[PDB]
Structure 1
Amino acid sequence: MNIFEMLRIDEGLRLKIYKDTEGYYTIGIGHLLTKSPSLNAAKSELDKAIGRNTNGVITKDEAEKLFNQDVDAAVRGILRNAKLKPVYDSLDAVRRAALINMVFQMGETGVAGFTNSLRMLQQKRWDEAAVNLAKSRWYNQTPNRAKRSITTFRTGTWDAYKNL
């Protein structure tokens, strides 16, 4: 298992523009296009992202290319963030993947906000961090997905994804 496989499980793959859990226009493997309520604005962002006139539909290869870029960006955002970097540095390989997942889903800013959980992960207080992470809008709105990342942080294994 790895970050790519992990996020592919969590986000799925759609080749036509769709609405995510929050109602925002997205495509491919969880690639957010825009928060604007306009399909056109979404179509325009899509074209700009792919480099051609798509008409809201892309190929699998195109989807994967956005995905690679998005994962790269997530890692880079973590390493550039003063609050995130130290945490990430302190963690093992499996847990690092969970941190990337959260950033991919909510953005660097969002995750940097989980101050207390972050301190707990840095301290390696797994059970406690898991409890704190659960007290969030994030867990309440997307419980199954959040639970998978939380378990990953708790156990340091891929057990939550084995079967999926």
Structure 2
Amino acid sequence: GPMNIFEMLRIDEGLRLKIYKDTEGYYTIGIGHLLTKSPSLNAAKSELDKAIGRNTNGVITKHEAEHLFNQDVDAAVRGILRNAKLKPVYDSLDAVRRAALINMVFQMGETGVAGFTNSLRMLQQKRWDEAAVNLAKSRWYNQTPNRAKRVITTFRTGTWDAYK
């Protein structure tokens, strides 16, 4: 089966069914669903219960995680469409590259992503190699080099060859 944003994110975020800490040290679960930014497992546990609508004692099913994953991806796409900075960039991109973008928003959030002012212009102007270079200079690249490298290659090439 050929790629999409779901498989892409499914690969970058992986699937975990116990509450774990993301690379930022924030508690999480499922496919990269942020529970809380607080360093409290107990705070994370309650936040999880609200999200799933039941008592989980830290554990959810595979279906439950896909349900969250769906809403979250959807939430990121809608976030981009309400962001004055991102929407134009998004609209100008081809399918593969819109996936790369949604990937960054999924991980970092809109605001964080809107901060890549220069790279964004390069993207909207189809200067693929220049943006790829500029994106590597970023804190984002340094904090998560492997995932960032993969995403950047997608921007540069417009192909799935970093995931295939």
Q: After TM superposition, is the score higher than 0.5?
A: yes
- String of CA shifts for 1:38-61, please: whole Å, max 9, x gaps: 011100100000000111100000
- String of CA shifts for 1:53-85, please: whole Å, max 9, x gaps: 111100000000000000000100001100000
How far 1:34 moved relative to its partner?
A: 0.5
SS in 2 for 1:27: strand
Task: Give, in whole Å, the separation in 2 of the partners of 1:36 and 1:158.
Answer: 35
Equivalent residue, structure 1, for 2:135: 133
Task: Give, in whole Å, the separation in 1 of the partners of 2:120 and 2:24.
Answer: 25
SS in 1 for 2:109: helix
Aligned residues: 162
Task: Give, in whole Å, the separation in 2 of the partners of 1:88 and 1:14.
Answer: 29
Task: Give, in whole Å, the separation in 2 of the partners of 1:54 and 1:11.
Answer: 21
Unaligned runs of 5+ in 2: none
How far 1:22 moved relative to its partner?
A: 1.1
How far 1:139 moved relative to its partner?
A: 0.2
How far 1:27 moved relative to its partner?
A: 0.2
Equivalent residue, structure 1, for 2:68: 66
CA RMSD of aligned residues (A): 0.5
Task: Give, in whole Å, the separation in 2 of the partners of 1:41 and 1:48.
Answer: 11
Task: Give, in whole Å, the separation in 1 of the partners of 2:114 and 2:79.
Answer: 11
Please state if 1:106 is matched with 2:108. yes
Normalising by structure 1, what TM-score? Answer: 0.98
Task: Give, in whole Å, the separation in 2 of the partners of 1:88 and 1:24.
Answer: 28
Normalising by structure 2, what TM-score? Answer: 0.98
Task: Give, in whole Å, the separation in 2 of the partners of 1:143 and 1:37.
Answer: 24
- String of CA shifts for 1:76-117, please: whole Å, max 9, x gaps: 000110000000000000000000000000000100000000
Task: Give, in whole Å, the separation in 2 of the partners of 1:39 and 1:153.
Answer: 36
Poorly superposed stretches of 4+, deviation over 6 Å: none
SS in 1 for 2:18: strand
